[PDB]
PDB file of C-alpha atoms and ligand atoms in Angstrom:
ATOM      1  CA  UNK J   1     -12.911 -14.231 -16.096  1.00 14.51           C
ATOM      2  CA  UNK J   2     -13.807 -12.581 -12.125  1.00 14.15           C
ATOM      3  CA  UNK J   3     -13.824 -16.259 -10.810  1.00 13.21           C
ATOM      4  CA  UNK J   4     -16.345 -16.567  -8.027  1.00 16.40           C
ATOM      5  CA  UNK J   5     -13.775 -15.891  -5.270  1.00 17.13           C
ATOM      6  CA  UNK J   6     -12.070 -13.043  -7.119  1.00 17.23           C
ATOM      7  CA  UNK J   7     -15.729 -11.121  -7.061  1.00 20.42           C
ATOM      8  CA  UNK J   8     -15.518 -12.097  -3.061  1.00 18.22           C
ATOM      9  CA  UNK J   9     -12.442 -10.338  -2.823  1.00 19.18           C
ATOM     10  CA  UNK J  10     -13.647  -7.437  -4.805  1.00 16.54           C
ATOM     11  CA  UNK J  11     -16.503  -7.196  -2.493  1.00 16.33           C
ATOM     12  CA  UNK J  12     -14.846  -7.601   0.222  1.00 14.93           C
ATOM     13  CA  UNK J  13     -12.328  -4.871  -0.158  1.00 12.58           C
ATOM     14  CA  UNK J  14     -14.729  -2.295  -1.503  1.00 10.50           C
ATOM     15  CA  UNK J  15     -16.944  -2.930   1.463  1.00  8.91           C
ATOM     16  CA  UNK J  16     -13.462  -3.227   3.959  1.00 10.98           C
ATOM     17  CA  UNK J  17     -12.807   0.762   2.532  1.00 10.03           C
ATOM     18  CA  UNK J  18     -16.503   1.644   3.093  1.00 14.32           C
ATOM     19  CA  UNK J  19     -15.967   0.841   6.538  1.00 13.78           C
ATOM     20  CA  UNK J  20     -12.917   3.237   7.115  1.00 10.84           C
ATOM     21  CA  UNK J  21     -13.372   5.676   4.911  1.00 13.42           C
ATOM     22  CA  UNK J  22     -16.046   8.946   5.340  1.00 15.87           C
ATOM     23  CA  UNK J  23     -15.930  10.529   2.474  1.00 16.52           C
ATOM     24  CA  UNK J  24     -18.064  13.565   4.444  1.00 17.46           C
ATOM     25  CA  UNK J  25     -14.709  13.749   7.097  1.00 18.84           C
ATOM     26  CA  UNK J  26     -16.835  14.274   9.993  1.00 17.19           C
ATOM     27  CA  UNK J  27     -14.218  13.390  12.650  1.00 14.62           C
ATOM     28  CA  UNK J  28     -12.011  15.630  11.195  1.00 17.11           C
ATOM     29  CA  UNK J  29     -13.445  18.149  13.772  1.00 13.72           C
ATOM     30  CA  UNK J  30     -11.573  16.047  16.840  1.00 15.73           C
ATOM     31  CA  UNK J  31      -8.123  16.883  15.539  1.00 18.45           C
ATOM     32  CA  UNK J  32      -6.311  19.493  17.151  1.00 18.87           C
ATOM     33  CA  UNK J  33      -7.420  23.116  15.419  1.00 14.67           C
ATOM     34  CA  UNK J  34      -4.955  23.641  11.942  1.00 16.36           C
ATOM     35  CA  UNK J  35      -3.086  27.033  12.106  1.00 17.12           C
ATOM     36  CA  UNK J  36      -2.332  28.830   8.718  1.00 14.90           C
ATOM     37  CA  UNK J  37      -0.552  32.052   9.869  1.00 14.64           C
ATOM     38  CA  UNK J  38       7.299  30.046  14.338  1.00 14.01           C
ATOM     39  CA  UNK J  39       6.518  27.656  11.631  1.00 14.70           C
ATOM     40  CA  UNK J  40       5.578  24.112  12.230  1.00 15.80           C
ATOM     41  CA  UNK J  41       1.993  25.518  12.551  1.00 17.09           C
ATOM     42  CA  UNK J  42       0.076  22.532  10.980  1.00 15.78           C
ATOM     43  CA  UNK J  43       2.151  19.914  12.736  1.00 15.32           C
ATOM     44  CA  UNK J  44      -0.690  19.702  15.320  1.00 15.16           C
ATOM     45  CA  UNK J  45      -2.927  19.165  13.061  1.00 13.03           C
ATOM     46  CA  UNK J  46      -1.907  16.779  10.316  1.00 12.34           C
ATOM     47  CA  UNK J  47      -0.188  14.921  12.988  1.00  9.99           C
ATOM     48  CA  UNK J  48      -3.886  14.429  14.300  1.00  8.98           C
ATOM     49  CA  UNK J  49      -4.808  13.734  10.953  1.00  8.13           C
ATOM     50  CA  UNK J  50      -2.452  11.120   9.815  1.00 10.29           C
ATOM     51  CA  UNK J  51      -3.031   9.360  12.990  1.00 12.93           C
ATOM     52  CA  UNK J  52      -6.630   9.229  12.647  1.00  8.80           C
ATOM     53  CA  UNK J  53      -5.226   7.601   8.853  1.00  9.72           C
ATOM     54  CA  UNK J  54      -3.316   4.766  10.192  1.00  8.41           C
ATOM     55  CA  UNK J  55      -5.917   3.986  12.319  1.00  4.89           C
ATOM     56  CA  UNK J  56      -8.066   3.513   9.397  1.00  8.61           C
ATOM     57  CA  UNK J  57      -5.482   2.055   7.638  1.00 10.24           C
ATOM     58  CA  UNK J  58      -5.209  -0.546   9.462  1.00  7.95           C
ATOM     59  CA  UNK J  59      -8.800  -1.420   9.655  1.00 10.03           C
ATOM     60  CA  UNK J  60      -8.643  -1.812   6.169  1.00 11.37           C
ATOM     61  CA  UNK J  61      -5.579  -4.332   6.550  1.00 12.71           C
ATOM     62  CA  UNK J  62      -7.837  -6.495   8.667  1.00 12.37           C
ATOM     63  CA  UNK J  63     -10.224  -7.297   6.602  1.00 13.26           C
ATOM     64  CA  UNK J  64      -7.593  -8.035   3.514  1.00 14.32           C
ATOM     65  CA  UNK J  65      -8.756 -11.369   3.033  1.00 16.65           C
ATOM     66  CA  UNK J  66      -5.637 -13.261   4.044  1.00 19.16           C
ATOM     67  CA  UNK J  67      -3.795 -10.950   6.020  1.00 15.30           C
ATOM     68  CA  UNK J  68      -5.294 -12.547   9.461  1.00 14.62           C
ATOM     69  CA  UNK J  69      -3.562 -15.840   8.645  1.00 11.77           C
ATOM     70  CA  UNK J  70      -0.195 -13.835   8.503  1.00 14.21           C
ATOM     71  CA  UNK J  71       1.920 -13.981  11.785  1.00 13.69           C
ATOM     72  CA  UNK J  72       1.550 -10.894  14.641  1.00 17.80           C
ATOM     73  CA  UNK J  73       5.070  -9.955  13.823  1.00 20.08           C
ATOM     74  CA  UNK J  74       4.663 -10.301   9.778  1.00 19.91           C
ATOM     75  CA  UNK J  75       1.170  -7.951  10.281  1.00 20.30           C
ATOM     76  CA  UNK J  76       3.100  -5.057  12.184  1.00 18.41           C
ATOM     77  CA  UNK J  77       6.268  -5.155   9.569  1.00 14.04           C
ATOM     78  CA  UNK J  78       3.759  -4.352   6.850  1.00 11.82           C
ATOM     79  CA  UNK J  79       1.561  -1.918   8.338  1.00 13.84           C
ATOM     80  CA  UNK J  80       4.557   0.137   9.475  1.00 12.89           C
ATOM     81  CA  UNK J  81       6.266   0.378   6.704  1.00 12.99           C
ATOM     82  CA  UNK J  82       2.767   0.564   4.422  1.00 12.94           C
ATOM     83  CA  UNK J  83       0.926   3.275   6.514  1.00 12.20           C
ATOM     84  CA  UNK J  84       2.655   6.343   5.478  1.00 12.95           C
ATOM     85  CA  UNK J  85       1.906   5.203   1.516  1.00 12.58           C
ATOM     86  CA  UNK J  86      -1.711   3.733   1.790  1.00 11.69           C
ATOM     87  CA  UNK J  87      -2.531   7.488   3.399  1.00 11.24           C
ATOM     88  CA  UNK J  88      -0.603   9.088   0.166  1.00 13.84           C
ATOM     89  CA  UNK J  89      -2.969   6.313  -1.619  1.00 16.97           C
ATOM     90  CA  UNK J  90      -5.720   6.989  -0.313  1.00 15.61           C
ATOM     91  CA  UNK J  91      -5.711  10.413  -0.135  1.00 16.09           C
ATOM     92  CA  UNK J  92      -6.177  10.676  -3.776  1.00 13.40           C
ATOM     93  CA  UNK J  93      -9.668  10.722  -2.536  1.00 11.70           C
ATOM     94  CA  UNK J  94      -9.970  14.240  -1.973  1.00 12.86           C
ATOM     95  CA  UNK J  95      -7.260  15.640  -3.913  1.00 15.64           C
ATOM     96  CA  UNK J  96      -8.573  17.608  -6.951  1.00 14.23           C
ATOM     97  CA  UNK J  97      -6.684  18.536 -10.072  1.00 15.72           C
ATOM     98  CA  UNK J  98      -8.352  21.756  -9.846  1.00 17.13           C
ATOM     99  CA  UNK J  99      -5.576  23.471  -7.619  1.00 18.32           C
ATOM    100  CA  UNK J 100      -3.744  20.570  -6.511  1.00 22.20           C
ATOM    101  CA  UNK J 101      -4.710  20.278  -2.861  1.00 23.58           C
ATOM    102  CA  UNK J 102      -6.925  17.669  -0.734  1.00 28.38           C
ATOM    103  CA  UNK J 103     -10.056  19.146  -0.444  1.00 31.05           C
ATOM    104  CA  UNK J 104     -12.132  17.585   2.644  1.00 28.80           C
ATOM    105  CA  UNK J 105     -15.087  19.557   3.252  1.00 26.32           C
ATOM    106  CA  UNK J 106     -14.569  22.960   4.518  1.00 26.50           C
ATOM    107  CA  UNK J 107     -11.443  25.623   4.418  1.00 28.77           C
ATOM    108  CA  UNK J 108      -9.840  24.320   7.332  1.00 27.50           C
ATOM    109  CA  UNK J 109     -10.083  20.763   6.088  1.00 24.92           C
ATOM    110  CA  UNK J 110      -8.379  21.852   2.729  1.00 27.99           C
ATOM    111  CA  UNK J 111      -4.703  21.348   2.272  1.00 30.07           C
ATOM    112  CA  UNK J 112      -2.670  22.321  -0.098  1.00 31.01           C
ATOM    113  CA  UNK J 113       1.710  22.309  -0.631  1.00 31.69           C
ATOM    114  CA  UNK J 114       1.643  25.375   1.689  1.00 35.33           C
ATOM    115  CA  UNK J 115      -0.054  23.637   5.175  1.00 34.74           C
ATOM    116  CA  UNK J 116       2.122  20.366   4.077  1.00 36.93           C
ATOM    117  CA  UNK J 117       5.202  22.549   4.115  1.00 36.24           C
ATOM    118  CA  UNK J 118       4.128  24.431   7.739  1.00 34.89           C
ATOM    119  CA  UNK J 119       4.377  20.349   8.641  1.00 35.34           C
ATOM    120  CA  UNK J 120       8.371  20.511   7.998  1.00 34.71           C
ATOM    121  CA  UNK J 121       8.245  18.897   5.093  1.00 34.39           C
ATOM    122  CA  UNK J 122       9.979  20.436   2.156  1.00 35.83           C
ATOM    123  CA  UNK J 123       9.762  20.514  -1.959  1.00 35.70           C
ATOM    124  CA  UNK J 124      12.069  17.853  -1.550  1.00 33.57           C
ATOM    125  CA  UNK J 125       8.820  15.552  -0.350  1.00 33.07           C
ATOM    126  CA  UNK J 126       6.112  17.825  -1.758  1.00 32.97           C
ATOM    127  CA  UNK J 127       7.417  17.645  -5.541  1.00 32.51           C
ATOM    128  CA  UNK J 128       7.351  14.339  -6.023  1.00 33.08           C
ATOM    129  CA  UNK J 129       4.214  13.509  -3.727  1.00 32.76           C
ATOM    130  CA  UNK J 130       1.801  16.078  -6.119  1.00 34.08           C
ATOM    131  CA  UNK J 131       3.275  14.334  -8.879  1.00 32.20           C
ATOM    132  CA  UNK J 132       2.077  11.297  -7.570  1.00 29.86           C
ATOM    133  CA  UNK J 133      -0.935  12.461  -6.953  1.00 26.53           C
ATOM    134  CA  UNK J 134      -1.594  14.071  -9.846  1.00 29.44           C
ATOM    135  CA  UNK J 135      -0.463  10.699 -12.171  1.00 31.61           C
ATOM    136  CA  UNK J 136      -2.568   8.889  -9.898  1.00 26.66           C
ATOM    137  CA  UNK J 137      -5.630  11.325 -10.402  1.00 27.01           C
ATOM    138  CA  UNK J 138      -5.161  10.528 -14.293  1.00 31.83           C
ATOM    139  CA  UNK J 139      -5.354   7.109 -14.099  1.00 34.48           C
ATOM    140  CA  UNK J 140      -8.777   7.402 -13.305  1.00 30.35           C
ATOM    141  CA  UNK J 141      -8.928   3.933 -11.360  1.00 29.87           C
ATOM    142  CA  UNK J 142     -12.215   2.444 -10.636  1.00 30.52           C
ATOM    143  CA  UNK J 143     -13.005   2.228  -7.185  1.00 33.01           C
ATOM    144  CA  UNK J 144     -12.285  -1.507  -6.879  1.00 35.72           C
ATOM    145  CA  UNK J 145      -8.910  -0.659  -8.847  1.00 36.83           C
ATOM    146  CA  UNK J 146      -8.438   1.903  -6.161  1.00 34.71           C
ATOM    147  CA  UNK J 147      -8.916  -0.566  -2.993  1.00 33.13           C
ATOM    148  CA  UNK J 148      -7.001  -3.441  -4.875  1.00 32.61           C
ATOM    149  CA  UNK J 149      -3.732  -1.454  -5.217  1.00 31.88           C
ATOM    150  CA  UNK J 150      -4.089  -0.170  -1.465  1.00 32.28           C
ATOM    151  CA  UNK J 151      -4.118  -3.800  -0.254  1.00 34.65           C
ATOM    152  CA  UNK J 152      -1.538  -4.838  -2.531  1.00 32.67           C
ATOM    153  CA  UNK J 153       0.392  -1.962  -0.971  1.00 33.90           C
ATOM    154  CA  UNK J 154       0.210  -3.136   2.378  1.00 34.35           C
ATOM    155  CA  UNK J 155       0.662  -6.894   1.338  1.00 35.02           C
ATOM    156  CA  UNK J 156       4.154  -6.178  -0.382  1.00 33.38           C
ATOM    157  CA  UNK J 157       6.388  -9.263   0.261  1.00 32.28           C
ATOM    158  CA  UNK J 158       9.838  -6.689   0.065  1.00 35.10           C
ATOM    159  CA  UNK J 159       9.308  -5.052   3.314  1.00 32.75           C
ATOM    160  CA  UNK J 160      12.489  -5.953   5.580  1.00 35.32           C
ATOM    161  CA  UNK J 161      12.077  -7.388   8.083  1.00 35.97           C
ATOM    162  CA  UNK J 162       8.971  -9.490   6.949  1.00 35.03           C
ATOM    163  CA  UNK J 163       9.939 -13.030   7.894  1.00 33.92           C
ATOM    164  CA  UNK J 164       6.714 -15.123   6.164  1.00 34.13           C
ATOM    165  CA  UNK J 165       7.532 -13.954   2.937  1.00 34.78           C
ATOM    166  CA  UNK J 166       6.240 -16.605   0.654  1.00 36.73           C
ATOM    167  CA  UNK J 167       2.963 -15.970   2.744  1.00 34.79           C
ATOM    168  CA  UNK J 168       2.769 -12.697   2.154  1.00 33.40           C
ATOM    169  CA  UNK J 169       3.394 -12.775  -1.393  1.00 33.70           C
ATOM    170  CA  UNK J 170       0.789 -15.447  -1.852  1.00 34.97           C
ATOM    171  CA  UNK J 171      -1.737 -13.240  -0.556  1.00 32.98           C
ATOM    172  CA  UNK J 172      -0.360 -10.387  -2.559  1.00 31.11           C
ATOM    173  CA  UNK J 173      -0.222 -12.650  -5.657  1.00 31.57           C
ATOM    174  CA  UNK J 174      -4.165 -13.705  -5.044  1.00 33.08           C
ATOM    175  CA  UNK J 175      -4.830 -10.047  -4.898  1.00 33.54           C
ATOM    176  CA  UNK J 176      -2.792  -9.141  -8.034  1.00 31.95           C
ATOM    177  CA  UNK J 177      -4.323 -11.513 -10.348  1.00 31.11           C
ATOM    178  CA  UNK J 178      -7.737 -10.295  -8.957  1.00 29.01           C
ATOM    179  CA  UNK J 179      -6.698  -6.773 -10.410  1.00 28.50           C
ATOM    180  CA  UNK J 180      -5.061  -8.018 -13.002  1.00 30.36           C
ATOM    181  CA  UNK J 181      -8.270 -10.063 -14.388  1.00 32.14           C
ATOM    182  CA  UNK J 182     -10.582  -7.152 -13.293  1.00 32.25           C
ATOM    183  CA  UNK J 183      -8.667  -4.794 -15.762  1.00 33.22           C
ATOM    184  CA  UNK J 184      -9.134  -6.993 -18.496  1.00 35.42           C
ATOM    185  CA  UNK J 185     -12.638  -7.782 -17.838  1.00 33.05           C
ATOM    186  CA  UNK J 186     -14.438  -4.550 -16.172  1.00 34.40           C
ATOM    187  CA  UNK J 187     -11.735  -1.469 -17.420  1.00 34.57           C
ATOM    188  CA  UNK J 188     -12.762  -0.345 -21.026  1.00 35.27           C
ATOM    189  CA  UNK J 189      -9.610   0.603 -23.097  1.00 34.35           C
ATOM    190  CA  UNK J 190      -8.249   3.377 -23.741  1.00 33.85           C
ATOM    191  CA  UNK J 191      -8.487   3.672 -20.210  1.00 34.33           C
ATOM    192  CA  UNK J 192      -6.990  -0.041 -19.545  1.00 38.34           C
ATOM    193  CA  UNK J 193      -3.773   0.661 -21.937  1.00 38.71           C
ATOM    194  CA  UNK J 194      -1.136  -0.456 -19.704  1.00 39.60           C
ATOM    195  CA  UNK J 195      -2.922   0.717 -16.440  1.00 43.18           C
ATOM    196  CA  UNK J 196      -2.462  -2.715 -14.522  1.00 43.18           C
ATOM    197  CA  UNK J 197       1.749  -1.991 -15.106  1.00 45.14           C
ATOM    198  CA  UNK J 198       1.170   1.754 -14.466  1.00 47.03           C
ATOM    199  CA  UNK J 199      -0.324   0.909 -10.963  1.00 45.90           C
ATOM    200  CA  UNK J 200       1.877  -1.114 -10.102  1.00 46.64           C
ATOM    201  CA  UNK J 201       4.851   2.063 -10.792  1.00 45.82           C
ATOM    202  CA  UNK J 202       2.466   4.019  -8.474  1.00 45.78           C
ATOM    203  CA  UNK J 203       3.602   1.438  -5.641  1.00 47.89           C
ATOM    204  CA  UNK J 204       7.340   2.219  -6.599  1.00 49.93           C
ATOM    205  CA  UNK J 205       6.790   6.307  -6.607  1.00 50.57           C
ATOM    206  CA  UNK J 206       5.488   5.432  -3.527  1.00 55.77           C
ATOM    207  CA  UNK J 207       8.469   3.645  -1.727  1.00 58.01           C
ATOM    208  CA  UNK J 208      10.391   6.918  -2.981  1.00 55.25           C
ATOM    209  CA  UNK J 209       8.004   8.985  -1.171  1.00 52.94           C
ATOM    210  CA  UNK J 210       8.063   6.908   1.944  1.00 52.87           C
ATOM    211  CA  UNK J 211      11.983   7.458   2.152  1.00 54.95           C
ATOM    212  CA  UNK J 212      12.125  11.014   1.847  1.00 55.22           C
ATOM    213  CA  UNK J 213       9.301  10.890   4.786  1.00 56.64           C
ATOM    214  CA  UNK J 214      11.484   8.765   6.764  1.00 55.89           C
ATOM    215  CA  UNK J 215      14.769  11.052   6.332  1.00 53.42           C
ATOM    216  CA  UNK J 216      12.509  13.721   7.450  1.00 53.82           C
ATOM    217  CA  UNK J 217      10.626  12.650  10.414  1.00 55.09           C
ATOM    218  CA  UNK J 218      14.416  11.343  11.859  1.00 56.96           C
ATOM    219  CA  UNK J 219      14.962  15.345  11.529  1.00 58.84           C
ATOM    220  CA  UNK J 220      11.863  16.422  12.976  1.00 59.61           C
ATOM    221  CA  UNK J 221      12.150  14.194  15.508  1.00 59.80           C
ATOM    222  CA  UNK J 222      15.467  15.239  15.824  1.00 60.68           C
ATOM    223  CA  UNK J 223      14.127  17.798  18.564  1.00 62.92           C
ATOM    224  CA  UNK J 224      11.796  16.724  21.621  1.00 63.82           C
ATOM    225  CA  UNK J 225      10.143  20.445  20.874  1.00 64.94           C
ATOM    226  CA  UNK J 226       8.448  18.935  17.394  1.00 64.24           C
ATOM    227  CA  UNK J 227       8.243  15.336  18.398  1.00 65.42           C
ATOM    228  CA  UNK J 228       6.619  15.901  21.559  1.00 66.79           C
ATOM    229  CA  UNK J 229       3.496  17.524  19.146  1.00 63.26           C
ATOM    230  CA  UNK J 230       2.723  14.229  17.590  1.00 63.43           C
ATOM    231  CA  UNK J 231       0.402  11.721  19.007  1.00 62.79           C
ATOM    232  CA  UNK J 232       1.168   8.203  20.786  1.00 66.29           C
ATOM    233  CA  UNK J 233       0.606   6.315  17.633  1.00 68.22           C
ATOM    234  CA  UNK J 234       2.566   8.217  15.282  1.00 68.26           C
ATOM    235  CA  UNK J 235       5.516   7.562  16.946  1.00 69.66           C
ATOM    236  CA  UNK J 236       5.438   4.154  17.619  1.00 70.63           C
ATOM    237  CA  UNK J 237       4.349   3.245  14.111  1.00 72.93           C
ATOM    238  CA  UNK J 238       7.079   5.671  12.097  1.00 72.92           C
ATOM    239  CA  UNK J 239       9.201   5.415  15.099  1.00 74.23           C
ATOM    240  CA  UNK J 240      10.094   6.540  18.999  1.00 73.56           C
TER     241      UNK J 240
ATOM    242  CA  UNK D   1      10.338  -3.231  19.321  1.00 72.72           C
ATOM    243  CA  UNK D   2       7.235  -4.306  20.600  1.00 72.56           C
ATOM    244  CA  UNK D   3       4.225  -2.140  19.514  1.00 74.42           C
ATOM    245  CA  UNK D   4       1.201  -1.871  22.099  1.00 68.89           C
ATOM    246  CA  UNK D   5      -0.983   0.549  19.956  1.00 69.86           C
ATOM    247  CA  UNK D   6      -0.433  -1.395  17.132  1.00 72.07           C
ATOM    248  CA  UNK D   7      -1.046  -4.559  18.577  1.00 72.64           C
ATOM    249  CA  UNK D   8      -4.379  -3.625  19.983  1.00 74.17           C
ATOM    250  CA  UNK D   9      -5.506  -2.373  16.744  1.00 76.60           C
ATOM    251  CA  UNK D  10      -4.735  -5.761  15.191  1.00 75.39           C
ATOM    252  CA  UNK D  11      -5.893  -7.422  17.747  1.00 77.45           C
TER     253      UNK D  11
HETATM  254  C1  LIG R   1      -9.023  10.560   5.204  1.00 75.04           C
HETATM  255  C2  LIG R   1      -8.159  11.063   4.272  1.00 75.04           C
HETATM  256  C3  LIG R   1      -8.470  12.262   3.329  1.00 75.04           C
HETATM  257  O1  LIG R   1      -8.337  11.809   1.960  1.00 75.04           O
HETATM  258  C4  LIG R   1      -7.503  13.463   3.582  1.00 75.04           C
HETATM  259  C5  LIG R   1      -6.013  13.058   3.593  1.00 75.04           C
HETATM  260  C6  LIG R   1      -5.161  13.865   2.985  1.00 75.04           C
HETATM  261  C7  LIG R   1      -3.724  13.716   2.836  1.00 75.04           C
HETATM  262  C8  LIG R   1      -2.809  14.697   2.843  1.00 75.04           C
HETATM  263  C9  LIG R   1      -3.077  16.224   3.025  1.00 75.04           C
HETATM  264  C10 LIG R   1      -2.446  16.681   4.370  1.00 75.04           C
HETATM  265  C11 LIG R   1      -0.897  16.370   4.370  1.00 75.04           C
HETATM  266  C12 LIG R   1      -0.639  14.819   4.109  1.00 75.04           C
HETATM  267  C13 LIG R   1      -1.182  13.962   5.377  1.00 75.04           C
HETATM  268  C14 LIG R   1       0.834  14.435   3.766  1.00 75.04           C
HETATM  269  C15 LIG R   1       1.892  14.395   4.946  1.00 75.04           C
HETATM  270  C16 LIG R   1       2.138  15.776   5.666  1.00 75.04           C
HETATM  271  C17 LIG R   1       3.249  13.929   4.361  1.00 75.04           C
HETATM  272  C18 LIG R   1       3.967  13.339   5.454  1.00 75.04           C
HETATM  273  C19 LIG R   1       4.507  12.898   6.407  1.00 75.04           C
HETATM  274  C20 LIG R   1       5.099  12.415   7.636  1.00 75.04           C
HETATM  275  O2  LIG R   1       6.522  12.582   7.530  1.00 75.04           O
HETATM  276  C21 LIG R   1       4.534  13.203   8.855  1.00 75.04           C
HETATM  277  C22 LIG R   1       2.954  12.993   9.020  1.00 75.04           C
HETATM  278  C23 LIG R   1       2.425  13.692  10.338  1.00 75.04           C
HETATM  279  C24 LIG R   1       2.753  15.261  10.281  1.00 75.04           C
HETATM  280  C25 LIG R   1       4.330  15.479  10.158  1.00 75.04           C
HETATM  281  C26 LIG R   1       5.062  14.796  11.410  1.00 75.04           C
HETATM  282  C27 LIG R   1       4.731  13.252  11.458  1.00 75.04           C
HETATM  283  C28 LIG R   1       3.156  13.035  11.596  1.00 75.04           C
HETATM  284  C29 LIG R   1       5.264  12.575  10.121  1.00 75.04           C
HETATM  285  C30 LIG R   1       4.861  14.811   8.821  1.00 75.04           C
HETATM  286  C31 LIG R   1       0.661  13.056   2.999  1.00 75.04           C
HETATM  287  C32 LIG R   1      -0.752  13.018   2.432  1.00 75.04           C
HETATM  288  C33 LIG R   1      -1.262  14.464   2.697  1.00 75.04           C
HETATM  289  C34 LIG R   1      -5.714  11.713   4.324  1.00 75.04           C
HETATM  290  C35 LIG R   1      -6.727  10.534   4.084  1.00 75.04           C
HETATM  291  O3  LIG R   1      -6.500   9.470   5.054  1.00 75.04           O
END
């Protein structure tokens, strides 16, 4: 099939993720310095990091064809509760299989369970979020695969608080049918056995993993000391 | 809540 506005949306997206994503991580070299050697060391940094993510994040939401029509209100409810899971998402980027860490560049842009850990996060988080990546990895998505499951992410009609949620599934349904139809056209088996329905259990790994971050952060921000290290941003969109 | 940063961005 790929109907003539499905191969729009297509474009669009894979164009929308050219736009906020450098795969060389130039900018990387504006976030506060990461320190391997009091723990907590790499809080500086990844906060940085993930900051820099949501900002990119959301330039990708923008140009989600249909998510301008969606309310002011509607647009902030999804990129809130989104943000923290389209960076897991689309971080599979530069994670490699080859010792399970992101790899962006250079040693100091290459993380691994060890820096995410000096970020108070535990195995508790950490487990489950290389699993994820690592099932991910496997599924060896094609890149429009890749940016139709991030949008789909951040177009989930679920979220609370979303108030325009026949709208917002709408758009999500437009973009699932577009993957969908892809799959069956563009993705080859074996490759295509059952990978529409195993993306979509990505999306619920990934509201798992976007709990235990929340229980988390509400302990890390628990103390001034560690929430005072994060950036404006950060704490308005996972909370202040 | 009322979110300035994001607003901007979406703006
Ligand atoms: C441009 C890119 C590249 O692919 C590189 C990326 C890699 C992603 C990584 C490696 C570094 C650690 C990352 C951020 C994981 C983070 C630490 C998990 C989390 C979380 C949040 O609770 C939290 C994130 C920041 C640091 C700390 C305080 C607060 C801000 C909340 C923990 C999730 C994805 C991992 C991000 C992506 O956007």
């Amino acid at each position: 099939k790929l109907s003539e506005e499905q191969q729009h949306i297509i474009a669009i997206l894979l164009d929308a993720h050219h736009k906020t994503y450098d795969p060389t991580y130039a900018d990387f070299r504006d976030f506060r310095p990461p320190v391997r050697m009091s723990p907590l060391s790499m809080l500086p940094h990844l906060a940085d990091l993930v900051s820099y993510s949501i900002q990119k994040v959301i330039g990708f939401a923008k140009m989600i064809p249909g998510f301008r029509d969606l309310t002011s209100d509607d647009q902030i409810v999804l990129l809130k509760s989104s943000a923290i899971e389209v960076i897991m998402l689309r971080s599979n980027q530069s994670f490699t299989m080859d010792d399970m860490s992101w790899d962006c560049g250079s040693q100091d842009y290459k993380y691994d369970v060890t820096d995410v850990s000096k970020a108070g996060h535990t195995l508790e988080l950490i487990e489950p979020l290389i699993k994820f990546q690592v099932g991910l990895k496997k599924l060896n998505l094609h890149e429009e695969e890749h940016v139709l499951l991030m949008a789909i992410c951040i177009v989930s009609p679920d979220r609370p608080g979303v108030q325009d949620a026949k709208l917002v599934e709408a758009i999500q349904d437009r973009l699932s049918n577009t993957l969908q139809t892809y799959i069956r056209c563009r993705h080859p088996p074996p490759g295509s056995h059952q990978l529409y329905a195993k993306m979509i259990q990505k999306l619920a790994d990934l509201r798992s993993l976007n709990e235990e971050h929340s229980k988390q952060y509400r302990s890390l921000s628990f103390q001034p000391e560690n929430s005072m290290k994060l950036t404006p941003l950060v704490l308005e969109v996972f909370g202040n | 809540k009322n979110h300035p940063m994001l607003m901007n961005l979406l703006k």
